[PDB]
Amino acid sequence: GIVEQCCTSICSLYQLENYCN
Amino acid sequence: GIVEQCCTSICSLYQLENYCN
Amino acid sequence: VNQHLCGSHLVEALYLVCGERGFFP
Amino acid sequence: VNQHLCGSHLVEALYLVCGERGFFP
Numbered sequence: 001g002i003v004e005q006c007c008t009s010i011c012s013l014y015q016l017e018n019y020c021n
Numbered sequence: 022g023i024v025e026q027c028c029t030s031i032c033s034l035y036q037l038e039n040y041c042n
Numbered sequence: 043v044n045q046h047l048c049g050s051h052l053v054e055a056l057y058l059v060c061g062e063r064g065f066f067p
Numbered sequence: 068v069n070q071h072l073c074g075s076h077l078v079e080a081l082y083l084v085c086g087e088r089g090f091f092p
Binding site for chain 2: 059061
């Protein structure tokens with residue numbers, strides 16, 4: 001999910017923006 | 022500067038990205 | 043320097059990059 | 068929810084959006 005990808009690990013702008021809307 | 026624009030105030034993605042490089 | 047985005051810092055990272063679009067949460 | 072980006076949170080906001088490009092600081 002967004003927590004595994006961006007909190008536990010490091011995510012990119014492209015990855016984070018795919019969680020928008 | 023970036024501190025007045027993004028810390029003291031709220032800045033947008035577009036504004037912040039203009040501080041890149 | 044923390045490259046992790048957790049909690050209120052994730053929420054903000056999303057208020058920042060998601061713009062007009064909005065985001066769930 | 069803080070929409071301000073100050074200190075280590077600004078630095079990170081910039082490590083995030085600036086990507087390949089880098090940023091000063």
